[PDB]
Design a protein around this ligand. Structure first.
Ligand SMILES: [Cu+2]
Ligand SMILES: [Cu+2]
Ligand code: NA
Lengths: 620, 620
């Protein structure tokens, strides 16, 4: 019944049939993206209309299309032909990955480069990487991938231990042409293996770990209804899934006594970029837009009980489309569970004699994706006290290079002759706010130091200041950890019992933002990553901070163009975009498989409730 | 056996007997501090010589003494008379707290102030607080406490809901004299109760929480030998307890194959200060040095299985001295257990076909202390991957005031007429480092941005720089979150297999440091709190960042005096002092009992190991 239900296999099958009957899904067509559209703003929307947005690629070279279909009515709403030289190429297709290695295997320049290095072409794996936009005029309007080579000594070998430096190739994957092969010089291929399941490397496995058993003998405290609607400890929300963004949370609300109070209308990770900081021409173009170029939802892992998710686990198995419109299930792709989270509140009072302890809990919604060498876990947490938190967990195998004789200012050494280029992992959270409703504003809160003097004779006072962001042109903000800077999202029309506007405070980790030069290609294409906080006025079509078509788009799309409209955001329907990331100088301990590192943000109530919201938690 | 074993009841009784026999502990004497001294530098050395340091107060007004005793030999090693007007007063005695309310109840100025407010003296509780050093010349050399009043409507009432603003009194607790009673005017006493166990306020308790059961069917993975020596998943350490500092960690080492490698010789929270930012004369003197003035270990809670600590718990019950030298056991005062900690490492490789997942765990060592209205949890974590982390959990009841009718820039409103002054909670971690031995150095690491141009034509490169701190005068450092600043502790004489010095990296939370005016009394007494990182050369008597005697001591001791020696710290036996804290602008949700908020720091290996140290973790 819910407009926010997960897409079903039958819905995707019907999209396929509609596209087919309409003549838009011939044998030369490929679906590069398919997803359900959210309902438009309408607090009286009764008629069910499930609409899907599709990006259709053409393998023969014809122009691609963007199509919207109504599966409820069995109709095509609109279909637009795309000029990709202007608006950007479609996301990379899974089937285009294999094409790069196969094309290069018959190119005489590639084979000559491998022969000079005494490498058997049958053992050379090619990582197919997005191209970006640089100096090659012949690439505009063409679907390009760039390839970097790694040697696999045997079929179960970790090829990442054996980069082939000094060599890169560019490939047109539509016309199947190798456009350039660049060979800058012979580097030794690092010889040590990185096989983290080889006993020669692990040594004898530990026998000292005893089991930790986490069970819920009466079942979990949350309920799931309608497939994806969660109720847990006064929280209410819908768990969505999109092939581009991954897990999306809808309609996050909190039951405060009799009233269901909205907090966040839609929360997602709307982009994530991995820029590399090695100036070598072999890699200086390397920037992954994992969400926008690759689509992180389509590479989601099936999560194994007891290994990936421990405890009493409830799974969702989202359905996506393959390249031909057939539904594909990602079995056990989302884990949901609650877990103990230590002490919530504690006080032992001398005067009253009362000793009081309560425990905390959090609800966890998670999925994991794998893009080539990297694996990312996305975790949303809901706490008893009203806190919402997101955490990204980065693991996998670091991207490698040769370690140059004489060292490097931009590459870490991991093993003899083996390097790991410096890079960042930067995320954009898109938070469509609805604090007690849609009339919201953002205030920037700084600590204020005060000077010793009249009214502050002992020099102990300090205070704080709040600045309302009133228009989009002034709503591009930077972190300031030294002044304790946070941002408050409030509803000026909804007051708590002290007659103060209700609000939530955003706490950032204050990690560095994009380090690249402001004139670089990546700074233009990932402009969102240069500032910690952006606020826009809500609009239906302003979905991603990098625009709809990120692959090989020249720049400026997304947030810089939205913000230019300079719309009123003071007590309006607004969207908060928070940039946060990890700056990774790889360490020896990251090799040959990297222990998890984390980054995130959290939102805490700030006078949203009339008192602590967890006074009714029992002692248990 | 071990020189680092916990003090036993018999050792404390023996100290009492030695002091009595020596004539230093007659009926007018009180023990204000007693603790075991760590062994001096040198392996083996004294075979076994357990020495105790004692601060002895005299209730007749005679000069107090500092005494060192050898319990092994039954001798007084040294005993020195203290001039407290010079070097500071002794820590506050538990028995002195009761004195304050009783003395005020018979003072006619106090009674007249209460009569003006129609308050029954039998219902007025007085919070006895440390005095600091301000403008009152008559306090020099006297033991003073200051008292703030709260009304308790009935014996089980939370008095914190009913502050009596406009009133403060100062008390000489040795001569039993009320020195001053200051009344700046009548404020309404806030009338709403704050009784968080009253059903009228909690409402009906939730029935929705189902149990989470955490068990270890084969017992825990760690072993405890010699009372306090822990071995867990390659870690080795001794858990100490001191009545001033609380839990102290000794001899933290990691078993790397055949070798036990030292990392940290001694880790403790060596001071913690809570300064208030309300310029009202009623509270502008208010600064708690919970460690140095009150002694946090003295007020450690007994922790209840299933509520405070959940899982398979191993307890330690440390013994401290009471004011007469009798041993007192804090039953179940320290909880130890291991916890699942999610995914450790994960990769699904397309080319090799291998899917790999391992889970993380951490060892937890914790205790909780209650100082009046506040309750603090101290948590040390050891992780499988070599990470060490500390986290402080702040909860309890916020300190209250009236909320002035026309508002305030320095106080939050929590309830009608009820305010909560702004304050900070600032900690000092003292890390006596021993990275692969005692020859250590500290490097500050900043990210370096690079300009687009020759050698960086695409404007993508970024790098980092490390600056060695060579002398104490240059080792007072500030955070810089914008440049990703961290500090590396390395051993220049111990190299990993890549011929790089082994090291650990300190990751700070980059929260604001002390906000008070640098000319204030608190900035002089808590000078450590004005900077994020200090490095000193190890010395036996440089134990606390505030000096030995903090109570009513002006500036002139502690870290600023230590670093003036300007000692060589480049490849030497060094101590890192890290300041970190919370800046608390109280919110409505903090009332009437505060949900936990947290702050901390972590240390991660940085080329300490030759590869990932968790390759031998099993799947299971
Ligand atoms: Cu990385
Ligand atoms: Cu506080
Ligand atoms: Na040291």
């Amino acid at each position: 019944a819910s407009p926010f239900r997960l897409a079903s296999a039958g819905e995707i099958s019907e999209v396929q049939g509609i596209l087919r009957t309409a003549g838009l899904l011939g044998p030369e067509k490929r679906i590069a993206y398919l997803g359900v559209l959210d309902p438009a703003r309408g607090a009286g929307s009764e008629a069910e209309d499930r609409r899907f947005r599709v990006f259709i690629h053409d393998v023969s070279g014809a122009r691609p299309q963007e199509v919207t279909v109504s599966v409820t009515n069995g109709t095509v709403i609109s279909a637009v032909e795309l000029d990709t030289a202007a608006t950007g190429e479609l996301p990379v297709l899974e089937e285009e990955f294999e094409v790069v290695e196969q094309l290069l295997a018959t190119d005489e320049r590639w084979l000559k480069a491998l022969a000079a290095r005494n490498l058997d072409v049958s053992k050379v794996r090619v990582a197919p990487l997005s191209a970006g936009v640089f100096e090659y005029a012949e690439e505009r309007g063409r679907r390009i991938l760039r390839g970097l080579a790694f040697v696999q000594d045997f079929p179960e070998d970790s090829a990442w231990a054996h980069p082939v430096d000094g060599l890169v190739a560019y490939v047109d994957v539509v016309s199947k042409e190798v456009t350039r092969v660049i060979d800058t010089g012979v580097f030794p291929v690092p010889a040590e293996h990185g096989n983290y399941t080889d006993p020669e490397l692990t040594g004898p496995l530990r026998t000292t770990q005893k089991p930790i058993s986490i069970t819920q003998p009466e079942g979990p405290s949350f309920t799931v209804t309608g497939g994806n609607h969660i109720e847990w400890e006064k929280w209410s929300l819908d768990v969505g899934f999109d092939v581009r963004e991954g897990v999306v949370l809808h309609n996050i609300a909190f039951r405060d006594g009799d009233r269901l109070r909205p907090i966040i209308n839609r929360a997602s990770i709307a982009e994530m970029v991995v820029p590399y900081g090695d100036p070598s021409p072999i890699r200086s173009w390397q920037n992954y837009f994992d969400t926008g170029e690759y689509l992180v939802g389509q590479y989601a892992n099936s999560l194994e009980l007891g290994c990936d998710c421990l405890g009493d686990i409830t799974y969702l198995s989202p359905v996506i489309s393959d390249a031909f419109g057939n539904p594909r299930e990602i079995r056990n792709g989302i884990c949901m569970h609650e877990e103990d989270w230590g002490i919530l509140a504690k006080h032992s009072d001398l005067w009253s004699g009362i000793n009081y302890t309560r425990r905390n809990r959090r609800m966890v919604i998670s999925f994991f994706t794998t893009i080539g060498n990297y694996d990312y876990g996305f975790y949303w947490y809901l706490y008893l006290d009203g806190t919402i938190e997101f955490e990204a967990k980065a693991t996998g195998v670091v991207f490698t290079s040769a370690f140059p004789e004489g060292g490097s200012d931009n590459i870490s050494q991991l093993a003899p002759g083996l390097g790991a280029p410096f890079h960042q992992h930067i995320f954009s959270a898109r938070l469509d706010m609805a604090i007690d409703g849609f009339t919201n504003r953002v205030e920037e809160e700084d600590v204020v130091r005060q000077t010793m003097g009249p009214g502050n004779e002992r020099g102990n006072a300090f205070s704080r200041k709040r600045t309302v962001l009133t228009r989009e042109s002034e709503a591009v903000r930077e972190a300031d950890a030294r002044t304790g800077r946070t941002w408050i999202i409030s509803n000026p029309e909804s007051k708590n019992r002290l007659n103060e506007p209700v609000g939530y405070k955003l706490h950032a980790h204050n990690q560095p933002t994009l380090l690249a030069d402001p004139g670089s290609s990546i700074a233009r294409r990932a402009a969102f990553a240069t500032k910690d906080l952006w606020v826009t006025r809500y609009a239906d079509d302003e979905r991603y901070p990098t625009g709809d078509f990120v692959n090989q788009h020249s720049g400026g799309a997304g947030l810089p163009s939205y913000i230019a409209q300079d719309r009123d955001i003071d007590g309006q329907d607004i969207v908060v975009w928070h940039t946060f990331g990890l700056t990774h100088f790889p360490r020896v301990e990251d090799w040959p498989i990297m222990p998890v590192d984390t980054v995130g943000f959290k939102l805490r109530p700030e006078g949203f409730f009339d008192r602590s919201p967890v006074l009714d938690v029992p002692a248990n």
